[PDB]
Design a protein around this ligand. Structure first.
Ligand SMILES: O=S(=O)(NCCNCCOCc1ccc(Cl)cc1)c1cccc2cnccc12
Lengths: 20, 337
């Protein structure tokens, strides 16, 4: 399931802001 | 009415914008209790102000690290904008000051935690729950945008839940007062509009795209565009394709197709009717926009309160000394702060 793919991904924790 | 309210809010804001508050407290007036969050160039700590006994969230930025990351102007923007704005769903800046090593922004403490943490734990929000939060963002952007401000980092991690279950928006680090177009690549990968990724000049329409991502994430429990690495996320965002969960209502998917619109002439929030295209949408038919503003709507969720300085809604972080050098660092760069 999509939920399962997300939970198994590396980006379920707090996401850092990015910039140049 | 809306127009009249916004007219006076602009008068209020402009006065503070042109004459910013500066140097309104000192580090020695606060007792440092615990780290609430940590960043590339600083951290946020729970503190107690001795004179009042009030708890606050103090953001401490290392000036040297700010300079190395080329965030001088962004940080000046952040403090200048925050001391000037005033709106029920924005975290309030109570004091600011600086010393030899650091910049300090003392803000209101919101003990309920980040939306992020409640959302991940619970899995997802019901449509009414999501709608209640989304409403507050719509109004907040209507306010910020009217002042020529772009916010540029909407995400659950930057939305705190207060003791009444309402949103407080924080993290103004990419907020900018700009009439017309700007170009800086900034934000968070999942929430970037296609035009930011494709290095075009962009405007406040990127915040409306980001709202679409937030609503999707809140209602789905995962974002519309995810992968393990940012580059893979950017490919999905620019591909022109989004898939919605089975459980998403027909109205919700229609709101979201109009927010997550690659075509600027078609993206909601950007058109001739502006924010009203969003506010008058079918998904928001039940929403009483004035009662949301007045905080007279009952929240779907109220965080567990275990006292004014309790941190149970926040993760633990490794504590690190606050060092103040005997030499002034970066005086000229931060002269106006
Ligand atoms: O930082 S917070 O704990 N929560 C917001 C988190 N934003 C998303 C990522 O933050 C990581 C981060 C934290 C601190 C700095 Cl300086 C850089 C990056 C916070 C900030 C401002 C006011 C607050 C009021 N109450 C509670 C927490 C507050």
């Amino acid at each position: 399931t999509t939920y399962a793919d997300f939970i198994a991904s590396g980006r379920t924790g707090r996401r850092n802001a990015i910039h140049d | 009415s809306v127009k009249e309210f916004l007219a006076k809010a602009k008068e209020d804001f402009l006065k503070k914008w042109e004459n910013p508050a500066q140097n309104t407290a000192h580090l020695d007036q606060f007792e440092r209790i615990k780290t609430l969050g940590t960043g590339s160039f600083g951290r946020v700590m729970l503190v107690k102000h001795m004179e009042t006994g009030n708890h606050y969230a103090m953001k401490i930025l290392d000036k040297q690290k700010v300079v190395k990351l080329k965030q001088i102007e962004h940080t000046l923007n952040e403090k200048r904008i925050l001391q000037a704005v005033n709106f029920p769903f924005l975290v309030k800046l109570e004091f600011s000051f600086k010393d030899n090593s650091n910049l300090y922004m003392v803000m209101e403490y919101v003990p309920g935690g980040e939306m992020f943490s409640h959302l991940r734990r619970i899995g997802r929000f019901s449509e009414p729950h999501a709608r209640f939060y989304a409403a507050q963002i719509v109004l907040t952007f209507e306010y910020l945008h009217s002042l020529d401000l772009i916010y540029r980092d909407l995400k659950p991690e930057n939305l705190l839940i207060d003791q009444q279950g309402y949103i407080q928006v924080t993290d103004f680090g990419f907020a900018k007062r700009v009439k017309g177009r700007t170009w800086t690549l900034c934000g968070t990968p999942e929430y970037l509009a296609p035009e930011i990724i494709l290095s075009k000049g962009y405007n406040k329409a990127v915040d409306w795209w980001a709202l679409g991502v937030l609503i999707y994430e809140m209602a789905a429990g995962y974002p519309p565009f995810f992968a393990d690495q940012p580059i893979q996320i950017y490919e999905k965002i620019v591909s022109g394709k989004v898939r919605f969960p089975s459980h998403f209502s027909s109205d919700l998917k229609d709101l979201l197709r109009n927010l997550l619109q690659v075509d600027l002439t078609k993206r909601f929030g950007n058109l001739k009717n502006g924010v009203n295209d969003i506010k008058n949408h079918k998904w928001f038919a039940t929403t009483d926009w004035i009662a949301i503003y007045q905080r007279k709507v009952e929240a779907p969720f109220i965080p567990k309160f275990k006292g004014p300085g309790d941190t149970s809604n926040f993760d633990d972080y490794e504590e690190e000394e606050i060092r103040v050098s005997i030499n002034e660092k970066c005086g000229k760069e931060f002269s106006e702060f």
